[PDB]
Design an enzyme around this catalytic site. Structure first.
Site, mmCIF file in Angstrom:
data_model
loop_
_atom_site.group_PDB
_atom_site.id
_atom_site.type_symbol
_atom_site.label_atom_id
_atom_site.label_comp_id
_atom_site.label_asym_id
_atom_site.label_seq_id
_atom_site.Cartn_x
_atom_site.Cartn_y
_atom_site.Cartn_z
ATOM 1 N N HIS A 87 -7.479 5.306 -4.558
ATOM 2 C CA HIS A 87 -6.908 5.226 -5.900
ATOM 3 C C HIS A 87 -6.129 3.937 -6.148
ATOM 4 O O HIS A 87 -5.377 3.489 -5.298
ATOM 5 C CB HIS A 87 -6.011 6.440 -6.165
ATOM 6 C CG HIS A 87 -6.719 7.746 -5.978
ATOM 7 N ND1 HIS A 87 -6.053 8.938 -5.786
ATOM 8 C CD2 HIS A 87 -8.041 8.044 -5.954
ATOM 9 C CE1 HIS A 87 -6.937 9.913 -5.651
ATOM 10 N NE2 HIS A 87 -8.148 9.398 -5.752
ATOM 11 N N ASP A 122 -11.146 9.205 -0.360
ATOM 12 C CA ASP A 122 -10.975 8.642 -1.712
ATOM 13 C C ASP A 122 -10.011 7.459 -1.738
ATOM 14 O O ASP A 122 -9.155 7.327 -0.866
ATOM 15 C CB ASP A 122 -10.531 9.700 -2.734
ATOM 16 C CG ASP A 122 -11.575 10.778 -2.945
ATOM 17 O OD1 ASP A 122 -12.686 10.612 -2.409
ATOM 18 O OD2 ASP A 122 -11.288 11.777 -3.646
ATOM 19 N N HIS A 127 -2.516 1.324 9.286
ATOM 20 C CA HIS A 127 -1.869 0.037 9.091
ATOM 21 C C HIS A 127 -1.740 -0.772 10.361
ATOM 22 O O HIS A 127 -1.540 -0.231 11.445
ATOM 23 C CB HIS A 127 -0.506 0.209 8.404
ATOM 24 C CG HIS A 127 -0.635 0.517 6.949
ATOM 25 N ND1 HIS A 127 0.293 1.253 6.245
ATOM 26 C CD2 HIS A 127 -1.619 0.210 6.073
ATOM 27 C CE1 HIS A 127 -0.101 1.369 4.989
ATOM 28 N NE2 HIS A 127 -1.276 0.765 4.864
ATOM 29 N N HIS A 144 -8.586 -3.453 1.568
ATOM 30 C CA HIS A 144 -7.575 -2.795 2.408
ATOM 31 C C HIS A 144 -7.704 -1.268 2.316
ATOM 32 O O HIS A 144 -7.768 -0.575 3.334
ATOM 33 C CB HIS A 144 -6.156 -3.221 1.974
ATOM 34 C CG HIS A 144 -5.045 -2.489 2.675
ATOM 35 N ND1 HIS A 144 -4.339 -3.031 3.727
ATOM 36 C CD2 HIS A 144 -4.520 -1.255 2.470
ATOM 37 C CE1 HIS A 144 -3.408 -2.176 4.126
ATOM 38 N NE2 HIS A 144 -3.505 -1.089 3.385
ATOM 39 N N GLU A 145 -7.733 -0.751 1.092
ATOM 40 C CA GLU A 145 -7.865 0.702 0.897
ATOM 41 C C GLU A 145 -9.156 1.284 1.510
ATOM 42 O O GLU A 145 -9.139 2.392 2.058
ATOM 43 C CB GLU A 145 -7.769 1.070 -0.586
ATOM 44 C CG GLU A 145 -6.463 0.619 -1.236
ATOM 45 C CD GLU A 145 -5.221 1.198 -0.567
ATOM 46 O OE1 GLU A 145 -5.303 2.266 0.070
ATOM 47 O OE2 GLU A 145 -4.147 0.579 -0.688
ATOM 48 N N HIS A 185 -8.738 2.254 5.048
ATOM 49 C CA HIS A 185 -8.230 3.609 5.242
ATOM 50 C C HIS A 185 -9.361 4.606 5.065
ATOM 51 O O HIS A 185 -9.463 5.581 5.818
ATOM 52 C CB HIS A 185 -7.134 3.941 4.228
ATOM 53 C CG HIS A 185 -5.868 3.179 4.434
ATOM 54 N ND1 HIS A 185 -5.204 3.151 5.640
ATOM 55 C CD2 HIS A 185 -5.140 2.425 3.583
ATOM 56 C CE1 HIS A 185 -4.109 2.419 5.520
ATOM 57 N NE2 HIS A 185 -4.043 1.971 4.278
ATOM 58 N N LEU A 243 4.252 0.242 -5.040
ATOM 59 C CA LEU A 243 2.968 0.542 -4.412
ATOM 60 C C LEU A 243 1.804 0.295 -5.363
ATOM 61 O O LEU A 243 1.875 0.566 -6.556
ATOM 62 C CB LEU A 243 2.944 1.931 -3.775
ATOM 63 C CG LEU A 243 3.199 3.109 -4.684
ATOM 64 C CD1 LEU A 243 1.899 3.484 -5.361
ATOM 65 C CD2 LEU A 243 3.758 4.280 -3.874
ATOM 66 N N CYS A 298 0.810 -1.204 0.000
ATOM 67 C CA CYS A 298 0.000 0.000 0.000
ATOM 68 C C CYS A 298 0.847 1.260 0.000
ATOM 69 O O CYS A 298 1.864 1.334 0.688
ATOM 70 C CB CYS A 298 -0.856 0.022 1.252
ATOM 71 S SG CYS A 298 -1.937 1.439 1.327
HETATM 72 CA CA LIG Z 1 2.883 0.467 -8.684
HETATM 73 CA CA LIG Z 2 -14.004 12.111 -0.726
HETATM 74 ZN ZN LIG Z 3 -2.678 0.777 3.388
HETATM 75 ZN ZN LIG Z 4 -3.955 9.131 -5.675
#
Ligand SMILES: [Ca+2]
Ligand SMILES: [Ca+2]
Ligand SMILES: [Zn+2]
Ligand SMILES: [Zn+2]
Ligand SMILES: [Ca+2]
Length: 227
Positions: free
Chosen positions: A162, A160, A195, A185-186, A189, A146, A58
């Site tokens: 990404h 958000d 983490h 996982h994201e 957050h 990442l 991440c």
């Molecule tokens: Ca990458």
């Molecule tokens: Ca937002």
């Molecule tokens: Zn993470």
């Molecule tokens: Zn981004």
């Protein structure tokens, strides 16, 4: 360049900054990393630590944050909305939609939150696929390294998620990274989790493919101790 990777990693994920704040060579920062990632605490750029640094993970920092954020970093409403702004061409759109839906379904069962797909920038959670610099000043790094990142609950970019479209997205079987697991996982957050130092936990920063249920006690307690 092993020293190159180590320096960049220790800096990017916040270990060097913390070491500085303690008045301390790579050793002290390696020690912090080893503690954070549950590796043997040797303070040496040893084989386990280099291997850890080479592992896809991440893009969110381990110690500290991307930047100063607004608010207290949890949602203050219960129906979180999300917008799938764009798609990777690696998977059919329906499969991507469902990967995201299933990822939210993990969190919805263990929180008083619900997740509702919408179609505008007004969504709490905007989901984007991007490459290199993709509009937020935290550029992705090409293949591997990442895989994705996200921002804690709040206004604007906050909340958000990404995904680095320089990765091959799949469901983790055969080839490519599981969009379902990375999204799960994201979204953690995006709900305000940091983490975990538990290596089997979903919120552990390194990518770990599994066919097992993604949540572990540490992830569930984490979200319980928030909402
Ligand atoms: Ca990458
Ligand atoms: Ca937002
Ligand atoms: Zn993470
Ligand atoms: Zn981004
Ligand atoms: Ca891709």
């Amino acid at each position: 360049t092993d020293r190159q990777l180590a320096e960049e990693y220790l800096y990017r994920y916040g270990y060097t900054r913390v070491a500085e704040m303690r008045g301390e060579s790579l050793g002290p920062a390696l020690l912090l990393l080893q503690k954070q990632l549950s590796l043997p605490e040797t303070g040496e750029l040893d084989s386990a630590t280099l291997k850890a640094m080479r592992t896809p993970r991440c893009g969110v920092p381990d110690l500290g944050r991307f930047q100063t954020f607004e608010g207290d970093l949890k949602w203050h409403h219960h129906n979180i909305t999300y917008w799938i702004q764009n798609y990777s061409e690696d998977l059919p759109r329906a499969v991507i939609d469902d990967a995201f839906a299933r990822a939210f379904a993990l969190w919805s069962a263990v929180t008083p939150l619900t997740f509702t797909r919408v179609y505008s920038r007004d969504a709490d959670i905007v989901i984007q696929f991007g490459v290199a610099e993709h509009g937020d000043g935290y550029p992705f790094d090409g293949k591997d390294g990442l895989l994705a990142h996200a921002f804690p609950p709040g206004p604007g970019i906050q909340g958000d998620a990404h995904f680095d479209d320089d990765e091959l997205w799949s469901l983790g079987k055969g080839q490519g990274y599981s969009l379902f697991l990375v999204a799960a996982h994201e979204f953690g957050h995006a709900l305000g989790l940091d983490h975990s130092s538990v290596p089997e936990a979903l919120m552990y920063p390194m990518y770990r493919f599994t066919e097992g249920p993604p949540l572990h006690k540490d992830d569930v307690n984490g979200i319980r101790h928030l909402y």
